[PDB]
């Protein structure tokens, strides 16, 4: 059962943030050059308060959160975000991470209801 | 190429309405052979009867410093400045 529950963006500086291991090969004591999809240094990153709009995916996303209450549980990734296409749903619960890809008919404003 | 890749990191923080400075590399978490297109996304929140940040990746050349223990500890974003 679906339930029906825009603000100007805030921005922050990503000083040296979002670097990841480009591959799974072990290296040590070396400076290695790589070309990949990375978050540019000191870029302008959009800041939201958990305000949960649908965002463009572009070429990939760096995501971060600061919390002490486990409010952010997961994400929806897709194209049409309706039964017309396959969509990727990633959610976390108290024991497991659950990942599914289906022709999901998503709610207009999806969330997990906690009692 | 049809593969949905996730990298991640988890630390404590004592700062407030902003991201911390300093270097930290994100490790591979999962690689899923899904084979679908993604153009839009949304966050899923738990609501009872916190803040997040979104940045976008670009094709950039980096110089990565691997320490004696094989962990990346520093990096240069080659397209940032001269």
């Amino acid at each position, epitope marked *: 059962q679906c339930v029906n529950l825009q*603000l*100007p*963006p805030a921005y922050t500086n990503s000083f040296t943030r979002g670097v990841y291991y480009p591959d799974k090969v072990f290296r040590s004591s070396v400076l290695h050059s790589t070309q990949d999809l990375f978050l540019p240094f000191f870029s*302008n990153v959009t800041w939201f308060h958990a305000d949960n709009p649908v965002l*463009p995916f*572009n070429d990939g996303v760096y995501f971060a959160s600061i919390e002490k209450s486990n409010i952010i549980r997961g994400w929806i990734f897709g194209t*049409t975000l309706d039964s017309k296409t396959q969509s990727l749903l990633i959610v976390n619960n108290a024991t497991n991470v659950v990942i599914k890809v289906c022709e999901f008919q998503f709610c207009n404003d999806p969330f997990l209801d906690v009692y | 190429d049809g593969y949905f890749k996730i990298y991640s990191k988890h630390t404590p923080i004592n700062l407030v309405r902003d991201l911390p400075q300093g270097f930290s590399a994100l490790e591979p978490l999962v690689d899923l052979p899904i084979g679908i*297109n993604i153009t839009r996304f949304q966050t899923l929140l738990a609501l009872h009867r916190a803040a997040y940040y*979104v940045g976008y990746l670009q094709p950039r050349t980096f110089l990565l410093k691997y320490n004696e223990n094989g962990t990346i500890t520093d990096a240069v974003d080659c397209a940032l400045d001269p």
Partner: antibody
Framework: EVQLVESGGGVVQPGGSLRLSCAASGFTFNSYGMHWVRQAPGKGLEWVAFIRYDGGNKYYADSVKGRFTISRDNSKNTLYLQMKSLRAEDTAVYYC???????????????WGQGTLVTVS | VIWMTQSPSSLSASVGDRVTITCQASQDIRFYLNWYQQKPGKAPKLLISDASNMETGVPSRFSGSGSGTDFTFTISSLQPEDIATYYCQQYDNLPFTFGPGTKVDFA
């Protein structure tokens, strides 16, 4: 809150050139790809060009391809269209817009500016 | 290039009448089609995306359906505020293309 404001319009001669711009506010300009669309007096809409969020890949209609250039500045939240070798047929109101698209731009919201008139005479 | 066309070029209808506008793509564009409404002196406003998905804030009297090359836009009960030109646009393949537009008059 969301605003798109075109400027740089006016009257030019055939074979000349003109630089149009569109200032953006109220939305994450640097997150979206942007389109240009034009409408001649008494006519329907014509799609002109598209640029990706990173200012990389660019696309043009055959009517402007090879003559017009699309660019952006994500630090100034501004979209630009540089037109060269203008013709009488290019007389139109030019609009900047974020067109809803589930394939290329990934835009969920649809926004348009007020438009700027360009006349070639 | 995928060309777009519309039929009729114009129609006349009264308040309470059902209005149907046909849009056709030169090639199969799945369900990827935007419907825009424009009044004189103003920028176009989106009413429908992905063929059938209604935009938030759009009155329930508006609808649309179709697939491939064949799309239809409907107003189930025309209001005096609905006198406008309607355009259909395909976003399946770049360059993107708009149809000629269908003009609705008040009879």
């Amino acid at each position: 809150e969301v605003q798109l404001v075109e400027s740089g319009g006016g009257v030019v001669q055939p074979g000349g050139s003109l630089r149009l711009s569109c200032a953006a506010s109220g939305f994450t300009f640097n997150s979206y790809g942007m389109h240009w669309v034009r409408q001649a007096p008494g006519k329907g809409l014509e799609w002109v060009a598209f640029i990706r969020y990173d200012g990389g890949n660019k696309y043009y209609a055959d009517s402007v391809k090879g003559r017009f250039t699309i660019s952006r500045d994500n630090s100034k939240n501004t979209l630009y269209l540089q037109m060269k070798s203008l013709r009488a047929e290019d007389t139109a109101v030019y609009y900047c817009a974020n067109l809803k698209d589930s394939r290329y731009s990934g835009s969920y919201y649809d926004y348009w500016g007020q438009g700027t008139l360009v006349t070639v005479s | 290039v995928i060309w777009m066309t519309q039929s009729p070029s114009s129609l006349s209808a009264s308040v309470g009448d059902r209005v149907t506008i046909t849009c056709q793509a030169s090639q199969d564009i799945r369900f990827y089609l935007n419907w825009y409404q424009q009044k004189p002196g103003k920028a176009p406003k989106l009413l429908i995306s992905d063929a059938s998905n209604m935009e938030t804030g759009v009155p329930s009297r508006f609808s649309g359906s179709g697939s491939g090359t064949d799309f239809t836009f409907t107003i189930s009960s025309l209001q005096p505020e609905d006198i406008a030109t309607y355009y259909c646009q395909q976003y399946d393949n770049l360059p993107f293309t708009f149809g000629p537009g269908t003009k609705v008059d008040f009879a």
